[PDB]
Amino acid sequence: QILKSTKQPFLESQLRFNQISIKDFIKGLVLSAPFRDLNYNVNNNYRFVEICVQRVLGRDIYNEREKIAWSIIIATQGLEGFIDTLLNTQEYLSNFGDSIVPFQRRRIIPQRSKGE
Amino acid sequence: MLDAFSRVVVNSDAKAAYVGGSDLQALKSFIADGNKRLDAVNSIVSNASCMVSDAVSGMICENPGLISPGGNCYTNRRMAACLRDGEIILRYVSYALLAGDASVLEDRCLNGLKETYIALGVPTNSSIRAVSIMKAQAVAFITNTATERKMSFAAGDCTSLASEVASYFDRVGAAIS
């Protein structure tokens, strides 16, 4: 979905004028309008939380209980409340902060070729 | 204001060292062609008035968008301001060439010129084009390589002064880049 109906020209124009930061840009992309029908309307709350943990926090889930635990914030607070309490964890701020695009943290072991 | 003599004084003052005969030879070589430096500075002051006007006219004839309505050199007031802007730069480069040290235009001319032009909306491309033209004119005057004007000098080589004055012009464009 780096097609053109998905691209937001206005978060971009506010990012390059230093009005919003990278963390606010990720928050604008998760709450964005093509993300809410191409990834949120096609999942339950359990698959969607492991999608949002893998792509924002840059790590896999710990077990099933983490999916079941975080699944409740989506239902009772909306996507806005869920993405606020995800972006304000110590894990996100200690690794990416407010000004770094997230990435898949520590995917491959350094000796080896095949990684995760 | 630091000339070539006070530069080695401020260099050896952090050492708390006396200026000895080892590093003095760089200063007696500065005296040995002081006449070449004066002969070089005179050849630029002699025709600075053609040098400025030719540079801005070449910058305008290369980029005809500056004289369009709403261009930065559109009206008579802005064009007079451009011819005034270039002459100050040439004057400070002549000061630095006479002093043998660039420290007279680091603080009196280029200190704050960067954001003055972008508070004013002065386009940064044409200013470095104009001083590049002025640099090409100045090197063509330190050596007798100008086309229609030839000045009479004693025979010898002045390439060191031409490289020095080119090095005085690149930091002007680098300060406003």
Binding site: - | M1, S6, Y18, G20, L24, K28, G34, A48, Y95, V104
Partner: protein, 164 residues
């Protein structure tokens, strides 16, 4: 940093004018004097541990009361600071000989010196005695050339006129 070049460029800058013929004419005098002013500077550079040695104890031979208790030169580190205070002035004389003007002296040695020597209770007459001793036994055919001696001595009594 007052010198020959520093004067004419600030004059041309205050007038807002290009370097004229009188500006270039003054630098020729710098060229003609560099061949007598630089000799004195490195002669001082190559000999400065003996000249400050004979000046500092000439300061104390004139004023032997400075080693009294309660004075400026009571114990040993005060005398070691006195030799350092003299060597600082001779280094600035070497710097003014290299520059051409009196810039290094009134920039780092003269400006504020009267406030320092008054509240720290140091006599300036004991400073000028060591400088006058250095000026008076400069011996012009052997120690320097004939012309380097006048250039070396002209900066020395600038200190004496400034401190007194």
């Amino acid at each position: 940093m007052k010198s020959v070049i520093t004067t004419v460029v600030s004059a041309a800058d205050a007038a807002g004018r290009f370097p004229s013929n009188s500006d270039l004419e003054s630098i020729q005098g710098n060229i003609q004097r560099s061949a007598a002013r630089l000799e004195a500077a490195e002669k001082l550079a190559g000999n400065h541990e003996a000249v400050v040695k004979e000046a500092g104890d000439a300061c104390f031979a004139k004023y032997a009361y400075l080693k009294n208790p309660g004075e400026a030169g009571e114990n040993q580190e005060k005398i070691n600071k006195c030799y350092r205070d003299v060597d600082h002035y001779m280094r600035l004389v070497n710097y003014c000989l290299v520059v051409g003007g009196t810039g290094p002296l009134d920039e780092w040695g003269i400006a504020g010196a009267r406030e320092v020597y008054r509240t720290l209770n140091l006599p300036t007459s004991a400073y000028v005695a060591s400088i006058a001793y250095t000026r008076d036994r400069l011996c012009v055919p052997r120690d320097m050339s004939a012309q380097a001696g006048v250039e070396f001595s002209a900066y020395l009594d600038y200190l004496i006129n400034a401190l007194s």
